[PDB]
Amino acid sequence: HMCDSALTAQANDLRIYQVMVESFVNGDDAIGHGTGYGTSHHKGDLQGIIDSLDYIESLGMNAIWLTPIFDSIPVEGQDHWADRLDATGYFTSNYFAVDPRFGTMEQAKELVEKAHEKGLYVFFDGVFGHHKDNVVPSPEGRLPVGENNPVSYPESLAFYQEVATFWIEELKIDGWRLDQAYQVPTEAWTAIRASVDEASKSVTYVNSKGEAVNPLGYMVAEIWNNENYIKETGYGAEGEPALCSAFDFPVRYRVVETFAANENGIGNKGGKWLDEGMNLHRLYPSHAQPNLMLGNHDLVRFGDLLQRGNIASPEQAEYWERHKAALSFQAAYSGPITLYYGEEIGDELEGYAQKVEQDCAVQGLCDDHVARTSANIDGLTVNLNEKQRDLKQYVSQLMTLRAAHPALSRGERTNIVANETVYIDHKQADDDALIYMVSTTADQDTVELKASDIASDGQLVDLLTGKVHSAINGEYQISLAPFEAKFLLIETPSASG
Ligand SMILES: OC[C@H]1O[C@H](O[C@H]2[C@H](O)[C@@H](O)[C@@H](O)O[C@@H]2CO)[C@H](O)[C@@H](O)[C@@H]1O
Ligand SMILES: [Ca+2]
Ligand SMILES: [Ca+2]
């Protein structure tokens, strides 16, 4: 059945902060895995997330996504690789209990309640295609069926329906990020989504505004592939929706290939490349709600990508301008967006940039986990420097701007310019029309823009600085610094646009 349309409006407003639990904040030094895949302290826990909720909210985020927190039970005599895998949460044993290296059921309850108190949605990480060999039966006596990886469908469906509704009914979480979602067939996703919607509509909590609300029931698939595969294995056909939201890996790659370079070194692209990527949204069915991230726990940090391509390093101003340009693109992107912890301060692993292959896992340096670095949370685990504070304040400005302007989060996109040096989108929702423009070049340039090309009948006003841009003979002349972004309100839109 259809993507439930109330969630659709809510989902376009999501600004999600992703935390990798084991590598985030060691809030209780008495517990923690103490080993894992990555260079972090490996003692991140639920208390550390609870300690970070004020920080996450002040960033302007309105939701948090935790990597799996369920109980990965060690088996006597298992090797250190298995010890490290237990720290990731992605090969779990008891889907219905909290891993004690992260915390207790009571602390997981406390976390969700306090997040809701502060106006944040909470999403958990559901791995419904695989698990550890010692999986334990559900409270209702169910087990997944088949191999440990991947499990068999539809034999395993009843079990994972029970998992997916349990955490909603017990903790009132607002939905699920779905790991490696193509391991679960589309018919199963339709039924799991029905279970999620039914469980969500069966409970309420009091949000920060004082209203009793159902948990969102949001579900976002991780399908690390191009649009044709995200459609085939995630969204389903037009008229027969499987899932309603999936991560926008294709545009993530276009963004890092424009403002940095990707892990394989493709980079130095321009606005034309970004536009071509956004245009491929036309391949998706009408119900698809792509979710743009710049990175995650499986991708190299943006700042390390900048160093890997010999593009920039934190000692150079351009390192920060490129972060701002990439984050500004996310802020202008309609639909849910996800920020990976540390991008807001330009994090990067000291001493690391080039790809490390031999012996990378025992070092914490493989591409697929090197971003799992100890979190730098201002006032909690770090005192930020001037450039770090400047980027974090910029991100707070973007998230605030996004919250106030429907054109950014749910506006219709019309590309105005997409060449090698600039990218200009017109965004409009109801009576909110603006221009998003971002430089894609290390050269200062002045952009000549016809008011008649953007349905502007008057001035343009910068929504962050308030600078007014007036037309002469119907044309604006806008100076763009290298990789500068501008959010320009169309103060008087034309009768027709
Ligand atoms: O030692 C093998 C392998 O383990 C890790 O890969 C994990 C990953 O960390 C988990 O998050 C999840 O995706 O499962 C993977 C195993 O299937 C290391 O990240 C990886 O480098 C290493 O080769
Ligand atoms: Ca700890
Ligand atoms: Ca580095």
Residue numbers in the entry: 0 to 496
What does the original paper state about this entry?
The GH13_37 subfamily is the most recently established α-amylase subfamily. It was created on the basis of the isolation and phylogenetic analysis of a novel α-amylase, designated AmyP, from a marine metagenomic library. AmyP exhibits high substrate specificity for starch over pullulan or cyclomaltodextrins, efficiently hydrolyzing starch into glucose, maltose and maltotriose. AmyP is a raw-starch-degrading enzyme (RSDE), thus making it of potential interest in the food processing and green-fuels communities. The AmyPΔSBD is composed of A, B, and C domains and shares structural features with other GH13 α-amylases.
The crystal structure of WT AmyPΔSBD complexed with maltose was obtained through co-crystallization of full-length WT AmyP with β-cyclodextrin (β-CD), an unpreferred substrate of AmyP (AmyP/β-CD). This structure was determined to a resolution of 1.95 Å by using the AmyP-E221Q/γ-CD structure as an initial model. The structure of AmyP-E221Q/γ-CD contains electron density representing a maltotriose molecule bound to the active site and occupying subsites -1, -2 and -3, whereas the structure of AmyP/β-CD contains electron density representing a maltose molecule at subsites -2 and -3. These observations suggested that the E221Q mutant possesses activity for γ-CD and the WT enzyme possesses activity for β-CD at the high concentration in the crystallization drop, thus producing maltotriose from γ-CD and maltose from β-CD, respectively. The maltose bound to the active pocket of the WT enzyme also superimposed well at subsites -2 and -3 with the maltotriose bound to the active site of the E221Q mutant. The observed binding of maltose in subsites -2 and -3 indicated that the affinity of subsite -3 for a glucose residue is greater than that of subsite -1. The observation that G2 binds in subsites -2 and -3 indicates tighter binding in these subsites than in subsite -1, which is consistent with the production of a limit digest of G1, G2 and G3 by the enzyme. It seems likely that a strong -3 subsite would protect G3 from rapid digestion, whereas a weak -1 subsite would limit the formation of glucans smaller than G3. The AmyPΔSBD-E221Q/G3 and AmyPΔSBD/G2 structures can therefore explain the nature of the limit digest of G1, G2 and G3 by the AmyP enzyme.
